[PDB]
Design a protein around this ligand. Structure first.
Ligand SMILES: Nc1ncnc2c1ncn2[C@@H]1O[C@H](COP(=O)(O)OP(=O)(O)O)[C@@H](O)[C@H]1O
Ligand code: ALF
Length: 783
């Protein structure tokens, strides 16, 4: 039997004593293909069971495996639901789900009627789908369906956050068939390509060690190139078996299954063989130690893809993949030192993803705050703010709640951009166009062509499947789709992705101000205006267009704004009053700013300041000293909210701090003479100004009644420079900032420059300055 059966009784005995159960067992213990069936044939659990598989290279496979384990040809008792299709029949009471189908299923049936068990598989991968699902399930176990059992399966012995959140939940832990694997480290050379060096390393291992080999790579292109390279350096008894995506599920089993006797096999797998899939016959592992992770960018609204070194947890998963059958060997293609510097664990997907779909789903569920849910990691605040802004651009929000259009979008259970494109259609023709566009953007094609019109025409059975599904969710029973309708719809959802060329050789510039690249001979480089919904970025460098359509700005919808600006550029010594018709940082039209109102060209002068610098304004001595004093206050009187006065802050806040004081300027010359002291001072409410005048004063009152201005500085301490006939009161040394910073006294400037000091207790060390020209006349408390 399988190593997990050893805990089958205990598991059962815990599945009935608690609403939640956590089971941890290493990879290879039949958690996905043995445990579900044994829980089916158990009277303790009532109803049907759903098993969440986040990957879906494992989901289809685990449905097929669990069906084969009963001779059942999945559909009879074991079924599955994918995003586009599914397989269920009256007698199936166990269903494998994936692609966020469970989150939608809970949205549509929040009592999960008919289900007594939900199994969250592969939870250590920390997918965002599973996090959301768990929050929803825990919320369902609050209302009715108290009886609903939650089994959370992880594959790592330690689950810190999970116990920390469900500390009243039974932890079942399996052990077993683990052999030691010698860990070897081989850094790759820099004069060799990646595919070439990995192939050389793998071929060397095959020639130096026995058995079959598992090789982890960052993606399918790496897999294909490394395989082509291996072809030459490998003997005749070696079978190269890719593993990715789907190729027939036959050669997939060709790589999972052992190698026919008299043959060794090299399996070329993505991280899907890290814990999701169990490769057989392996005792040699080659880990490239590089992987592709997603990082959302609130600035650009793009999820860029970054190739980074893998964590330690994953390196250990991979090394252990070679010890299931006998003593093995893992070879990591980095240097031991870099491996020890590696990140301890992987980052939860929820801390680095786009949460627009997540925000929308939590809103439909009736949430006030996205963070008021049962989370392992709390959704980052910046990304929640970006999700909210995106949902506002798309009209999905009405205040903090969902609006009507937003509720329709939330209905379709889609990526919010695509959902908004689906909802914005009026006709049935527009709706079908949007359906096919959505099918293509969810599952882009890997053709050497980058136009969206050819994809829109190019046939595909799965795109048609998903468009039919979306059209039945939309309830449009007859429509016709042509390409002339692609561009208007896109404009409502991918508006921040419109793009204008930069010369020929069509490196472009996007509306969010990052620019993109096509390849120098794509058909589309001949076009002024593109709109690119699919972009690839990562590793501030570009920006390569993956899928995009042609566009003609004439007659387009009404998403363009006006930016006026008035500058006085010196080179040719003339003024400048432009009005740009822009759509988001891309200048469409430039026209003269003729006959402008006074509100505009107040704003236009503000834009001019923003583009030429605050040096433009009339920085008088009092004003410079005020800016210095505010810097100093922020660093010395922290407990009060001192408005930051760096250049960027003031340039961004011009609207709120300089505009109010401008009514009555009417010209650029009159603005350039405006004293800004009062506007900076206005940056403070009454009482903050009083605070800054008493604490951090403009001038110190020495013990003779002679007010003497202080010199503030960004870096240096404040300095007095008093004539020192008058520094005889000796209070204890003058101090400012509620007694925390003592003035640096320039005791001299009588003639100047004889001692600078900050202690006022060199009286008992001055002991020189009793010699002054006539005499001192200073000693011992004169005044
Ligand atoms: N398609 C398959 N072909 C052969 N063996 C399989 C298959 N699926 C599962 N197994 C067997 O099940 C075990 C690993 O699967 P499983 O216990 O589901 O791993 P996990 O613990 O990651 O769920 C192995 O011992 C293997 O013998
Ligand atoms: F079902 Al598993 F690792 F938990 F493959």
């Amino acid at each position: 039997s399988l190593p997990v059966a050893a805990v089958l009784p205990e598991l059962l005995t815990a599945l009935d004593c608690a609403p939640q159960v956590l089971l941890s067992a290493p990879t290879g213990a039949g958690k996905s293909t043995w445990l579900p069936l044994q829980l089916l044939a158990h009277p303790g659990i009532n109803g049907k069971i759903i098993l969440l598989e986040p990957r879906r290279l494992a989901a289809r496979n685990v449905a097929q495996r669990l069906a084969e384990l009963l001779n059942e040809k999945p559909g009879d008792t074991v079924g599955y639901r994918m995003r586009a299709q599914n397989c269920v029949g009256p007698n199936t009471r166990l269903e494998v789900v994936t692609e966020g189908v469970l989150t939608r299923m809970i949205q549509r049936d929040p009592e999960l009627s008919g289900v007594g068990l939900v199994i969250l598989d592969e939870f250590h991968e920390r997918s965002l789908q599973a996090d959301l699902a768990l929050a929803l399930l825990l919320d369902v176990q609050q209302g009715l369906r108290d009886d609903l059992k939650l089994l959370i399966m992880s594959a790592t012995l330690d689950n810190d956050r999970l116990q920390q959140m469900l500390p009243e939940a039974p932890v079942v832990i399996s052990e077993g068939r683990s052999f030691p694997v010698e860990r070897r480290y081989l850094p790759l050379p820099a004069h060799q390509r990646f595919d070439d060096a990995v192939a050389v390393a793998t071929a060397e291992m095959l020639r130096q060690e026995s058995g079959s080999l598992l090789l982890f790579l960052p993606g399918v292109g790496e897999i294909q190139r490394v395989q082509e390279q291996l072809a030459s350096r490998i003997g005749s008894d070696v079978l190269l078996c890719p593993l990715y995506g789907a190729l027939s599920l036959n050669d997939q089993r060709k790589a999972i299954l052992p190698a026919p006797q008299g043959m060794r096999k090299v399996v070329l797998a993505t991280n899907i063989a890290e814990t999701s899939l169990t490769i057989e016959g392996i005792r040699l592992v080659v880990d490239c130690a590089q992987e592709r992770v997603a990082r959302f960018d609130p600035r650009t609204g793009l999820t860029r893809l970054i190739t980074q070194r893998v964590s330690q947890a994953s390196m250990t998963q991979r090394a252990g993949r070679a010890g299931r059958l006998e003593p093995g060997i893992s070879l990591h293609l980095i240097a031991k030192e870099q491996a020890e510097r590696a990140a301890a664990q992987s980052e939860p997907e929820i801390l680095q993803s786009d949460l627009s779909g997540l925000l929308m789903e939590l809103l439909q569920w009736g949430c006030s705050d996205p963070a008021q849910m049962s989370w392992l990691d709390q959704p980052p605040v910046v990304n929640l703010l970006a999700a909210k802004r995106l949902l506002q651009m798309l009209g999905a929000l009405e205040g903090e709640r969902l609006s009507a259009q937003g509720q329709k979008m939330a209905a379709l259970g889609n990526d919010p951009r695509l959902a908004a494109m689906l909802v914005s259609a009026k006709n049935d023709d527009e709706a079908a166009t949007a359906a096919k566009i959505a099918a293509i953007l969810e599952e882009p094609p890997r053709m050497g062509n980058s136009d969206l019109g050819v994809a829109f025409s190019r046939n595909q059975p799965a795109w048609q499947q998903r468009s039919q599904q979306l059209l039945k969710r939309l309830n449009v029973r007859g429509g016709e789709a042509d390409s002339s309708l692609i561009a208007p719809l896109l404009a409502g959802a991918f508006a921040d992705r419109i793009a204008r060329r930069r010369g020929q050789d069509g490196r472009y510039q996007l509306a969010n101000g990052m620019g993109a690249m096509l390849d120098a001979n794509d058909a589309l480089s001949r076009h002024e205006w593109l709109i690119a919904p699919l972009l690839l970025q990562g590793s501030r460098i570009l920006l390569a267009l993956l899928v995009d359509i042609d566009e003609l700005v004439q007659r387009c919808p009404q998403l363009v704004q006006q930016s006026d600006t008035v500058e006085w550029d010196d080179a040719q010594g003339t003024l400048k009053a432009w009005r740009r018709l822009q759509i988001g940082q891309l200048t469409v039209k430039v026209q003269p700013l003729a006959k402008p109102s006074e509100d505009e060209l107040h704003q236009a002068m503000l834009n001019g300041i923003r583009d030429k610098g605050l040096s433009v304004l009339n920085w008088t001595a009092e004003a410079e000293q005020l800016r210095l004093r505010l810097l100093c206050a922020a660093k010395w009187l922290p407990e009060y909210d001192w408005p930051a006065v760096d250049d960027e802050s003031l340039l961004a806040a011009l609207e709120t701090w300089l505009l109010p004081h401008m009514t009555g300027v009417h010209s650029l010359r009159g603005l350039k003479s405006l004293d800004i002291y009062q506007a900076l001072r206005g940056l403070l409410d009454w009482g903050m100004q009083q605070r800054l005048d008493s604490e951090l004063p403009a001038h110190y009152t020495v013990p003779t009644g002679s007010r003497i201005a202080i010199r503030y500085h960004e870096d240096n301490p404040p300095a007095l420079a008093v004539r020192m006939q008058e520094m005889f009161g000796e209070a204890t040394n003058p101090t400012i900032a509620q007694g925390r910073v003592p003035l640096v006294l320039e005791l001299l400037s009588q003639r100047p420059l004889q001692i600078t000091r900050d202690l006022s207790d060199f009286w008992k060390g001055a002991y020189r300055e009793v010699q002054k020209e006539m005499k001192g006349r200073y000693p011992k408390h004169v005044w």
